[model samples]
Each structure stands twice: as structure tokens, then as C-alpha cells.
Target: FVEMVDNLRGKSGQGYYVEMTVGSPPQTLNILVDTGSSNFAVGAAPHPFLHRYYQRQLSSTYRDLRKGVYVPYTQGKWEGELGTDLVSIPHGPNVTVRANIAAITESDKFFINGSNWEGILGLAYAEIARPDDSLEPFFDSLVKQTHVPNLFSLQLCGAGFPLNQSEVLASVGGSMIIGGIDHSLYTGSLWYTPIRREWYYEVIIVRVEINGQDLKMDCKEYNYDKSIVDSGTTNLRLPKKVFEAAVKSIKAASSTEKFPDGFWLGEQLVCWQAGTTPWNIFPVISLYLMGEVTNQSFRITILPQQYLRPVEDVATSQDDCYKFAISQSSTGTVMGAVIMEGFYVVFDRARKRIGFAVSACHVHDEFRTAAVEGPFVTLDMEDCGYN
Candidate 1:
């Protein structure tokens, strides 16, 4: 029942957060919830957080490991001292668990600067929970002591989006189900795949398709297992070469109606909106994930429009642009939040399988995913990936 609330930090970065308190007598803090990394940390004072840092002096239970930490992100990096203390998960029995935490020492850059978020809450595995893996992760700690199962689900709402500006982010509201899957958060069958490795939600992306056409990728050359689906990332990402090819193909396809820059926020977006009528006149991009390794009977279909949208270039032209968020990484490939938002995501570590189905944004009567009924054919997705 750890709800994902809007960051409302009045910043440009669009991310969701979890409200939790740590230390003795509990100091309330807004922590950025991420499935990408595995380190839970807070920004110390001097930065004006909602209520920053776990002051060793005030907290009776704070135990300093004296171990230093340094974690880097696209936004900025966090460096601090590692420690352990009592943490309160607003979610029932999972509350009051002793978990590892990083108390910031130096971070005036990215998120710490002007963001509403005051801390970093990692939701991945326990192995890489820290710079040295010395302390146990928060989730792992919960599974050991609390009534929680080794399972958690994230349903991100698109907050801070404008009305007419919402080809995406319409219902900017969602939640995170801790301990077990809320059978009601999604529709249809649940698609589950064993994690290739116990790392970031690893999966095999067979190939990428624009419309019904393949990006012409040679799958064998890639160690598909190396890719991780990261919820901490704000946009979609791909290998350098794949990104280039996909972008070129999309741009070319977009020019049919003389819709040049149909998907270019100065060339940063890859969703739609040519400012051109019937944006659907543009094609859709799909990333095909290999279903059971037993046979290729299922190719988990990932819809583009469901996850794609333009970033309003507030700095340049106050205009919306559609382009690829895919990055060129020869070594790493990540499917980030943009894609995760469209599906009901379940990180079932106990069973070693990550699950998905069409997101039932309707779970929340008031605010949910997509205007979610739109652009969807079958919301009742069958988790029939097991062959």
C-alpha cells in the first residue's frame, strides 16, 4: 500500500515518489521511488528538503557504518555516508523495519538542488543495494522481517501534464502495491517471465518494430539478457546504433504528409503530434519482448502511443515534439518508466519472474493511466506468456 504520489517539487523532471519516514521518532521525507538502482538515501540539511537527512544526533537508533557512498544518475550524483536505522513504511506491517540508508554529505547538483524529493528510495534487488553491497536493502529487509512477500508492483501516473498537451500524462495519478500483486490493478491475463538474472528487471527484447516493420536488427549480436527495465529512467532507451536506425526510420515515415518534425522537440521526442491532424495517421513503434524461451509462440507486444509523448520544449519554442528517447549504449540497454507506465508491472522476486498486463489505470476511480481507455484494443491482457 505504498502509494506513488506526485513529486510536486515544482520542477521540470517528471517522476513519482513514495512518502516514508526514517530514524527514531521518524522524520518525514519525500523519497524518489526508483526500480533502477538499489540504494535508499536521503539528502542532508542545507538543501531545504521537505525534511532532509537522518541526523545521527536526534535519532536514538542511528548506527553509522562510517562507509562512504557515491551514486551517479542522469540528473546528478549522490555522495554520502552509509548507515542503518529504523524506517517506517507507511504500508502496515512493513512499517518500522530496520534498513540501510545513506545520509548525504555532498550533492548540490541534480535532484537535490530544486526538486521536491528529499531522498532516493531504490526498489531493485539487494545485491547491488549499495556501492559495496555491505548493507541489506530496504525491500530485502522487509521480506525477511515483515509480513511482506518478495513482491512489489508500480503503477505510475503521468502528473504535471497539461490538458491539450496530454497525448500522454492525462490522468497523472497511480500507486505502488507492496508485498503482493493487487489482483485488481490490471486486466486480462498476466504475462510472467523468469528473470534472466537476479538484477534489474532483466528481459530479452527480441527486436524492435516501427509499425509492423522490423528495425532490421540482427538479434544474435546482442546479449539480450544484459538489458534491464528501469523505472527510474524518465525516457526510453536503446543501443546507439539501434537508436539511430529507429529515429531515422521514424523521421522518414513521419515526412509522408510533409509532417517534418512531427516527432521532434528539436529532435528529442518520439511519440506523435505533428500538430498535424489525425496524429494516428503517423505510425506506431513497438518493442517485441521474447515471451517464454521454450518456444517463440509469444511476442509480448509493447505499444508505442501508449508510452510515447512529447516533452514541451519550454526553453526553445513552447511547442511539443515527438522523438525517440532511446539512447545509444553499446554496453547497456534500458526500458525505462515511459514504457513501464503503460503496463501493470510486477517485480516478483520470490518467484523470480517479472509480470505484466495492460495497466488497469481504472483501478483508481478518479485518477489513473491514459485517458487509459483510449488507444487500447484489449485492456484485458492475458498473462499467457508461459508456453
Candidate 2:
């Protein structure tokens, strides 16, 4: 039997969150779903930014593990105490797992003011869990306790929408199906890619293309440092070198209209008179991933709307504006919500492989832009793997 946990809230800019019950007598709190990191942490103390937090003392089943936990992200960091408590997904599996929980005492910008989630539920692997890798991640414990399949799938349907000030904290619908894959949430057969490392759901990116034309950079450039599919991140994050090359390629291929450097730098938003559509001015971008088989690759393509995210807060002459959702990252390439929204992603950890298929919502009304294709010939470049 499989567990279908639905109604995941939030949008691309704010990240997606879900409701879950934690501790004895069942204290409920919203948790941010982050696949990029491992450590199921909650706000234990009063926080000006948090809506509500977990009171470890209130739970009869809670036990202080006496370990300190710290997590640092690209944007913010938090510190907390490690503990164990009963946890369950009310809308998901009925079985409860006594899982590790980081009772967060303080944070620095990790919990943003006016944000809805009170904690972050990391879903990566035990290898990167705080305190030490010896600690078991929540999902690992959940699977052990419930005897559920060691796999989960995500369908994030919040991209390609305009953002507004009033709607900044607003949410959209999505689902996180645990223990098994949901055939209904996606279209066609799923394509598989080998998980390069246990730490981050790491994968090998073989190539990148703009408007159907290959960027032609060294395959190593696509996998510089590492490449991971992370839902926690809001946008597509590329290594600085890869970012500049892709942006330059996009500008050159995208007709005669030249957007200013600030636009590509994400420092300025592109706006046009109300009646005009800016999507046509941009071109599609594609990422090719190495397939499980030797010398084979698959392609995932995104339309302009995926990267040119609308900024509903700013208005100029009743005009519409959009922010370039792709950012330059010093760390590595992160296939965040901007790319995940285009497909039904499967974290099949049990088999050490990840899968992707077309999301149902992406074609709900016969509207389509995102796509996946081919067990095409892989490039001859040696060692696309991280150094």
C-alpha cells in the first residue's frame, strides 16, 4: 500500500510546505519540504517570523537526544537541539515513526518574516544529516517503522504564474506521494537517471541547450562541483560560468530585442505595456541528463515562462514585469522548483536512481511548454562526474 500526501502549499518564490503532526497528543505544524538538505528541524522556541512552533516539553513521548544540531544554507542558517518524537502525516500513512527532530532555538533569516512554514523537513539522505551521518533521516525512519517502500515522488504545480505582493505568501496545489509513485500525477513512462551520490540526490548533467541549440560547453562544465535536483531552492541555479554562457546564448538566440545586462543579472525585471507578451521574446532552455545506461542521455526542456517568472508586486504604467528566475551559483547546478515544476520527480532512493516524467498539471488545460525526450547518444567528454 502507498501513502498519498497531498495539498502541498506555497509557490516557486517562497518554496513549498506541507502539514504534518508531530509529538504526543499530536501537535500540528507546517513544515517546509526541502530535498536539498537532511535534518528534520522545527522551531522550538518563540520566533517573530514563525506562525507556530513545536513545544518539545508538551509531548509525553519526546526525549532529549542531548545533541546540538546546526544547518547552514546558501541564504540562512539555524541552530537547534536534537531530540526524538512521534511523527505522522495525517493525510498520508497512518503509522507513526519515532523520528529524529531538531528543535530549533534560533535562526538567522532561515525563517523569513510572514512565511507560513514553522519548520523544515529535510528529505535528502542520512549522509548529510546534521550532528552526524549516523543519524537516520525522518523518511528513513518512517520507512523502517511503517514498512513502506523506500521511495517518494513530488509534483510541484506552482510555476509559470504571476507573483503579486498580496499573493507573495499565497500558495498553490501540489502533492508529495510517499512509499510509492503516483501514476496519475504524471503522463507517460518515467525516465531514470543514476543517483551519483547519496548526499544530495546528485545526478550527472551531460549538456545544456538554448532554443534547441546546444550550448556546446564542456560536459564537465554542466557537472562542475555537483548537480542535484532540489525542490527547496526556488529557481534554477547554475554554476557562475555555466550561467553566464547560458545567458549569453539566450540573448544571442532570442531575436533582435536585447534585454539589458541587469535583466539577465536578475538585478532588473523585464516589463512591457499591459497588452504585450514578453514570453515570445525569450527562448526555451534545455538540460540533458545522463541516463542509467552507458553513453545515453535524456533531455528536459523548459519554456520562457518557466524562467521569466512574473513579478506581480511591481507595476509600471499598468505594465507587466517578470524576474529572471535563473541565478548564478558558486556552489553548483541546482535543478530547483523552476525545473521540477515541469515534471513529476521521483526520488527512488531504494534503487539509487531518480526519475522524471511530465506533470499532469503542466498540461491540465492542453497548455504545454515543459518536455522530456530521448535516450540520445551521450557526449564523448570524459568524466562528467564531479571532481
How does residue 208 of candidate 2 score in lDDT? 87
Model 2 per-residue lDDT tens digits across residues 101-174: 99999799898665678988899999888878988998999988887889988998764546553464454558
What TM-score, over all chains together, does every model reach? Answer: 0.79, 0.93
lDDT of each: 0.61, 0.82
The predictions' CA RMSDs to the true structure, in order, are 6.5, 2.3
The residue-by-residue lDDT of candidate 1 on 1-387, one tens digit each, is 424232212111345566688888887876777788888888765564443555767888888888898887756787888888889866434457888888887875645443456787887876666585666778888788787778888766443233332332333456677776766667766776567676566766555567658777665323332667787776676666666777778667667555335334234443224343234544556655555435342333444343344445444444444444445555556767666666677888888877777666421112222221212222222332211
User: Among these predicted structures, which one has the highest lDDT?
Assistant: 2
